[PDB]
Structure formats: structure tokens, C-alpha cells
């Protein structure tokens, strides 16, 4: 897939992603905060179409992600990220995608997600997150 | 179980844990680094005994944990950490215990585990890790 790395910011305002209920996560884009201004991260697009978009608009700064979780598994012979769920202090967004395969989760007791990086081909292949106080 | 919280230190020198291949992880004690000196952490023991003890002696400071993974499952009506595996930049230690149930993992791309907290009853119920640069 095509690598992306947004780098680190001050916070997260909005997450825009797409998914298909038969396959996996497709497109991924983040509006970060950068010292009080929205920072529109690049839209990391799947190589294919046919996904459902979601916009997760957070009530920044009072609302922030406390746990990211999901499933990884086979699609078309590749291991990809099948589903994502974002749980904030205010509510739960998702699951999006297909909830089967190997679960994973990153709960946070203290600190903030400030950035994403990863790889997207037909589907989101993998990702990592930058953490800060 | 009984909660514990070691707090944060400057590194990890040694992990002493115990486990049983029919049940789960039992006891947990960390020798931390504190500014280049060893600090022997509290020894968090199960309410019961019979576990097989393991000492993971790291080649600190060149050797450090890059990933912790494990399985969570039901043992005699208790949902607990059934196994643990510690992967460093040098080698993998484990799995210790029973690799059956729901997997979890914390892979680290940048940063260090500097502390543990959690709960231990008959077995290790759950744990969290302090992370630092």
C-alpha cells in the first residue's frame, strides 16, 4: 500500500474515514488541532472505491479519544485493518467495517493521541499512533 | 484482586513473573532502573501459590522491550491474563502461560515502558504500562 505519516499535533478535532461492511477500512483523514487552529491532514485514499464515509466530529477540546480498538484479518489474501472503534470520554463511534479476525485495542489511562501514520492500499494495511501528554 | 501501581521509573532491568501452563500468570515483580541504579519494585503475589517462577534479565541499557503481548481468558470463573510474551530488540521471552482466549498486544515504535500497574488475585486480572521517551 501507500505509506502515510501525518506526524504529531496538539490534539484531534475530526476523523473522516470510509469503510465497507463486507471488507475493511478504506480512506482515512484527520483534522488535528495545531495550537488552537484546525490542521487539515491529507486525505489518505484507498486505491479503490465503494466505501461508506463517516465523519466523527469531536467536541474538541472537552471530548477526546480514550480507546481505539478494532480487528485485523484477511481480505483478498492481505492482512488489513477490518474494523475501527473510537471511544471518547463522551461516546462511542463505531464499530466501522467488519468485526472479525484478531482483535486489538489501545486504551489510554493518561495522555492523548496526537497523530497517525500507516499504509493504505485497497484497504488500510496497518497504522500507528503518536501519543503525548 | 489486589491493586498495585509501581509508578514510573527510568527503565526496566529485570522482570520476575510466574505462571502455570494449566491456569494463568500468577505473580509479578519488576527490577526497574532509576537514573542508572537498580530499584527493586514491590513483589505483587497471587493469593495462591504453586506457580513456576521466571526471571527475564535484560541487558540494560542496550536491551529494551519493543512489544508486550498476551492472551486473556476465563480460568475457574475468573477472567485473567493467561499468558504474557515480552519481545525486546534482542529476543522474545515467552510465551509464558496458556496462549488461549482473546489476544492483546502493545507494540512500541518509539518510547519505553517505565512502569507497571494492575491487579492480581488468584491470577493477574489486568495491567497497564507507563510509557516515556
Amino acid at each position: 500500500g501507500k505509506a502515510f505519516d501525518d506526524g504529531a499535533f496538539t490534539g484531534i478535532r475530526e476523523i473522516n474515514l470510509s469503510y465497507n461492511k463486507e471488507t475493511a477500512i478504506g480512506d482515512f483523514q484527520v483534522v488535528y488541532d495545531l495550537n488552537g487552529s484546525p490542521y487539515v491532514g491529507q486525505n489518505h485514499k484507498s486505491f479503490i472505491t465503494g466505501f461508506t464515509p463517516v465523519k466523527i466530529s469531536l467536541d474538541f477540546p472537552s471530548e477526546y479519544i480514550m480507546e481505539v480498538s478494532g480487528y485485523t484479518g484477511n481480505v483478498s489474501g492481505y492482512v488489513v485493518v477490518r474494523s475501527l472503534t473510537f471511544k471518547t470520554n463522551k461516546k462511542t463511534y463505531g464499530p466501522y467495517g467488519v468485526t472479525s479476525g484478531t482483535p486489538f485495542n489501545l486504551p489510554i489511562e493518561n495522555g492523548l493521541i496526537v497523530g497517525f501514520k500507516g499504509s493504505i492500499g485497497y484497504w488500510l494495511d496497518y497504522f500507528s499512533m503518536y501519543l503525548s501528554l | 484482586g489486589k491493586a498495585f501501581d509501581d509508578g514510573a521509573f527510568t527503565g526496566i532491568r529485570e522482570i520476575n513473573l510466574s505462571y502455570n501452563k494449566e491456569t494463568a500468570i500468577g505473580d509479578f515483580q519488576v527490577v526497574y532502573d532509576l537514573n542508572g541504579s537498580p530499584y527493586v519494585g514491590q513483589n505483587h503475589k497471587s493469593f495462591i501459590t504453586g506457580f513456576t517462577p521466571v526471571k527475564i534479565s535484560l541487558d540494560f541499557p542496550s536491551e529494551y522491550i519493543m512489544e508486550v503481548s498476551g492472551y486473556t481468558g476465563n480460568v475457574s470463573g475468573y477472567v485473567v491474563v493467561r499468558s504474557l510474551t515480552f519481545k525486546t530488540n534482542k529476543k522474545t521471552y515467552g510465551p509464558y502461560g496458556v496462549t488461549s482466549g482473546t489476544p492483546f498486544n502493545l507494540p512500541i515504535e518509539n518510547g519505553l515502558i517505565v512502569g507497571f500497574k494492575g491487579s492480581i488475585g488468584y491470577w493477574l486480572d489486568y495491567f497497564s504500562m507507563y510509557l516515556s521517551l
Partner: peptide, 15 residues
């Protein structure tokens, strides 16, 4: 160096 660093956890997905 003169570049600031940040804790990064992951990846999840394909290895």
C-alpha cells in the same frame, strides 16, 4: 538533533 520526538505505539494490522 533539533527534531522533537514523541511516543509512538503500533503498528496494528499487517506485519
Amino acid at each position: 538533533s533539533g527534531i522533537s520526538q514523541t511516543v509512538i505505539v503500533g503498528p496494528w494490522g499487517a506485519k
